Amino acid sequence: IANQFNSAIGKIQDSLSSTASALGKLQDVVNQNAQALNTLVKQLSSNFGAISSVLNDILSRLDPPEAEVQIDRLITGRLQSLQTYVTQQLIRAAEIRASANLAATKMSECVLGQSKRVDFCGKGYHLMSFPQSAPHGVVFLHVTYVPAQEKNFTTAPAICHDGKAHFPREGVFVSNGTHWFVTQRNFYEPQIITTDNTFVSGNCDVVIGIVNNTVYDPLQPELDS
Amino acid sequence: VSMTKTSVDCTMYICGDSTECSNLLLQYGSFCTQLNRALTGIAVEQDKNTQEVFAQVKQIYKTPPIKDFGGFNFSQILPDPSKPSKRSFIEDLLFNKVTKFNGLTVLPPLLTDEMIAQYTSALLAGTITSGWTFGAGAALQIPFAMQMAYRFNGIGVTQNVLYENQKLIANQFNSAIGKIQDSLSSTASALGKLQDVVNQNAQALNTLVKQLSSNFGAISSVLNDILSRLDPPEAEVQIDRLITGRLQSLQTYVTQQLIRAAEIRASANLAATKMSECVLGQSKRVDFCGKGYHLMSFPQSAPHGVVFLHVTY
Amino acid sequence: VTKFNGLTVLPPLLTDEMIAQY
Amino acid sequence: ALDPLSETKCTLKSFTVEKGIYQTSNFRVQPTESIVRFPNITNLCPFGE
Amino acid sequence: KNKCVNFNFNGLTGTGVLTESNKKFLPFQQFGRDIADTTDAVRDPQTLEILDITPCSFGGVSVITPGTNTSNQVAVLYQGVNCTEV
Amino acid sequence: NVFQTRAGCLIGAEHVNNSYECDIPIGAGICASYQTSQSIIAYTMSLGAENSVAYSNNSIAIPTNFTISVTTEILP
Numbered sequence: 001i002a003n004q005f006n007s008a009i010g011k012i013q014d015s016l017s018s019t020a021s022a023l024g025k026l027q028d029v030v031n032q033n034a035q036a037l038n039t040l041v042k043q044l045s046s047n048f049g050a051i052s053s054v055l056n057d058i059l060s061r062l063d064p065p066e067a068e069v070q071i072d073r074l075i076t077g078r079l080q081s082l083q084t085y086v087t088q089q090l091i092r093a094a095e096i097r098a099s100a101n102l103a104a105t106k107m108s109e110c111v112l113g114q115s116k117r118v119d120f121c122g123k124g125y126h127l128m129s130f131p132q133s134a135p136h137g138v139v140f141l142h143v144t145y146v147p148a149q150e151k152n153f154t155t156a157p158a159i160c161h162d163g164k165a166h167f168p169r170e171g172v173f174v175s176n177g178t179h180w181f182v183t184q185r186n187f188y189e190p191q192i193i194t195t196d197n198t199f200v201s202g203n204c205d206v207v208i209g210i211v212n213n214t215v216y217d218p219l220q221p222e223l224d225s
Numbered sequence: 226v227s228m229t230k231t232s233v234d235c236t237m238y239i240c241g242d243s244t245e246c247s248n249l250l251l252q253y254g255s256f257c258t259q260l261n262r263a264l265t266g267i268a269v270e271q272d273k274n275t276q277e278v279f280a281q282v283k284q285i286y287k288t289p290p291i292k293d294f295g296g297f298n299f300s301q302i303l304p305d306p307s308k309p310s311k312r313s314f315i316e317d318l319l320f321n322k323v324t325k326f327n328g329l330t331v332l333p334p335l336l337t338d339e340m341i342a343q344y345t346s347a348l349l350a351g352t353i354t355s356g357w358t359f360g361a362g363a364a365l366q367i368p369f370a371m372q373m374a375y376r377f378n379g380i381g382v383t384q385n386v387l388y389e390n391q392k393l394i395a396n397q398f399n400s401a402i403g404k405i406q407d408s409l410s411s412t413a414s415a416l417g418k419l420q421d422v423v424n425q426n427a428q429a430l431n432t433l434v435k436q437l438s439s440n441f442g443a444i445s446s447v448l449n450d451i452l453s454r455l456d457p458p459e460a461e462v463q464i465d466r467l468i469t470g471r472l473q474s475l476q477t478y479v480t481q482q483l484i485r486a487a488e489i490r491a492s493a494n495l496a497a498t499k500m501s502e503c504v505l506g507q508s509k510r511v512d513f514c515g516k517g518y519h520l521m522s523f524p525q526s527a528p529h530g531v532v533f534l535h536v537t538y
Numbered sequence: 539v540t541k542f543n544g545l546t547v548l549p550p551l552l553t554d555e556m557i558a559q560y
Numbered sequence: 561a562l563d564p565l566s567e568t569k570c571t572l573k574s575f576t577v578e579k580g581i582y583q584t585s586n587f588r589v590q591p592t593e594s595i596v597r598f599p600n601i602t603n604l605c606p607f608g609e
Numbered sequence: 610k611n612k613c614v615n616f617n618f619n620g621l622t623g624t625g626v627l628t629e630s631n632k633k634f635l636p637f638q639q640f641g642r643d644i645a646d647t648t649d650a651v652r653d654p655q656t657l658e659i660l661d662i663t664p665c666s667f668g669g670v671s672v673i674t675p676g677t678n679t680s681n682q683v684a685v686l687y688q689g690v691n692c693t694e695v
Numbered sequence: 696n697v698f699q700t701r702a703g704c705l706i707g708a709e710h711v712n713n714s715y716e717c718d719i720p721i722g723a724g725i726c727a728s729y730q731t732s733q734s735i736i737a738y739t740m741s742l743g744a745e746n747s748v749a750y751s752n753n754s755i756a757i758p759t760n761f762t763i764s765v766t767t768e769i770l771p
Contacts, residue, residue, distance in 0.1 A: 005763050037545060084259070103770040118360065118506035123766060144763070147358075147362045157368075183757055186761075208388070282743070283743050286748060333702050565674060581671050597617075598619060
């Protein structure tokens with residue numbers, strides 16, 4: 001686990017260094033703001049129906065009563081430009097506040113504690129996360145537990161020994177083709193079937209698919225000794 | 226999940242087939258360009274919702290030819306190959322209950338309805354064979370009888386209840402699915418949440434077209450009438466009034482779509498969250514997957530949306 | 539990851555150093 | 561115009577000023593003098609002759 | 610130069626601070642513009658020189674004061690500018 | 696190279712029956728990519744490889760090994 005982790009962190013440094021597009025989510029925010037500012041400014045050069053976009057030009061040509069007619073067109077149009085800008089900033093702000101609430105939620109469930117939610121902290125079973133600062137944002141490195149290699153085994157829902165069905169207290173029943181072993185679902189660690197690893201419930205005539213085997217009782221050699 | 230993709234042309238809407246009207250529109254700057262870029266982004270976001278929601282898996286899962294479900298009957302939820310298009314018996318009802326030349330363009334979706342059903346089939350076939358594993362890693366086949374056993378042990382119910390009552394749980398489940406088909410078939414308003422999306426887009430488009438009939442203070446709404454009556458310098462006065470109002474109409478439509486675009490994306494994130502917690506795995510959150518202790522969920526495709534059937538204890 | 543018309547850029551409340559110290 | 565405190569009261573339209581920071585105006589520097597630079601006035605015709 | 614003034618050069622006008630820059634206009638180019646199509650520089654019509662246009666200092670005025678019931682002390686903050694008026 | 700789709704007439708793209716992963720999205724489940732003498736080609740978007748999971752009452756898979764993975768997530 002020390003090699004897998006350290007090797008994984010190394011790939012993070014290589015991916016972020018080689019691939020600059022992984023941060024494009026943050027670059028979009030910069031680009032969107034630049035387009036809005038560049039647009040808002042360039043609208044000053046528009047006539048908006050007026051003779052000219054320059055204020056002093058209209059004032060230096062038309063008479064006072066005639067100029068006001070043309071100046072009003074510039075004021076009206078330029079006013080609409082601000083309304084368009086502010087309207088977009090308010091909407092875009094809602095998208096950022098939604099992401100911020102998501103980031104604050106992950107730090108609590110992912111970073112601070114351990115999250116049982118499915119695929120909230122990323123694929124696999126979440127262990128712990130590393131927060132990292134990023135411009136106008138944040139980065140989360142999520143360490144997860146991903147199962148790799150598996151092998152097909154023979155299973156049974158219950159074991160029958162003395163006539164009472166035995167159920168696993170934890171794990172599942174598996175077999176290599178000879179003896180039935182108990183094992184956890186996330187990994188293969190053979191464990192002998194015993195009264196301590198199983199629970200007695202019902203009889204053997206109910207469970208569908210129950211099989212017969214020998215349940216080892218650790219108390220037998222203790223009483224014989 | 227998704228909303229109708231609409232591309233509005235600010236050149237044709239404001240000025241129909243008019244050179245003079247077009248030149249007067251350039252005086253207003255980038256308004257035309259900007260209004261098109263906004264709608265373009267909205268149309269792209271609609272495709273992102275389907276990708277972030279419908280597809281939770283990189284592989285396609287299929288069921289075996291021999292079907293042993295442990296007493297449950299999935300024939301209603303699983304696609305039927307006999308149909309011309311791949312869909313289940315429930316999806317068949319979901320699609321049935323829910324259903325210009327002025328420069329309004331309807332953009333087709335990137336993801337076809339058939340492909341959406343293939344995503345659903347992959348999620349359905351996965352949960353049956355692989356249970357909760359395929360979402361968190363490599364597909365691990367488990368007998369369904371043991372899958373439900375683990376799902377009861379997660380809610381605090383000893384799995385012995387399943388093996389003993391397995392026959393009863395088979396009747397309650399199958400009978401429950403039958404009620405879903407009867408409810409969706411008899412009640413057409415269950416999908417009204419999706420019909421509201423269709424109606425909202427229709428009203429916005431209809432209203433936008435009706436504004437063309439308004440004079441906006443001008444002598445007449447038709448541009449050819451103004452050009453065929455007033456002098457060139459006099460026509461500019463009347464044409465400016467039409468452009469000014471029609472410009473506000475687009476600003477109103479776009480502004481309304483961006484707002485509704487924030488509402489749909491919020492629901493899309495919920496759908497993506499539920500598919501992860503409710504469908505792929507088992508959620509311990511209270512009343513997130515629906516009333517009762519959540520066991521497992523069935524995703525089902527619906528027009529411009531998705532349906533979740535939550536099996537609870 | 540990387541005017542003269544009266545548009546003012548307001549400085550952030552917390553410097554890049556402070557967010558790194560969090 | 562008495563002091564910045566009054567400007568806050570006039571910006572808030574209230575006699576009571578709450579604790580905090582508020583923007584009461586916009587500072588701007590006015591031009592000191594008018595500058596005029598034009599091309600040379602030379603190349604006259606011999607109108608005096 | 611190096612002062613806030615209202616300048617009129619040939620057919621162009623504006624208000625700002627004029628300072629000698631390192632920019633070089635071609636022999637036929639009297640004035641430059643910015644990405645926004647605003648004039649950032651000019652060339653003296655009489656002599657040959659390049660002058661950058663820096664808008665005169667402007668910014669917001671923020672008042673920092675405690676509650677009225679606390680004290681009437683006030684602290685003026687000139688945004689986006691150094692200390693000038695004082 | 697004049698072909699028709701549900702989005703409209705597309706010129707300059709060759710039609711490849713083989714389904715690949717979507718590169719340049721077009722519409723109606725159609726995407727374009729630059730591939731093999733390379734030229735633009737049109738193809739149906741592939742949803743991924745078909746995986747048939749062996750399923751039986753007595754069959755189960757127990758992972759024999761694991762891997763620790765580090766995922767990178769970014770938020771504004």
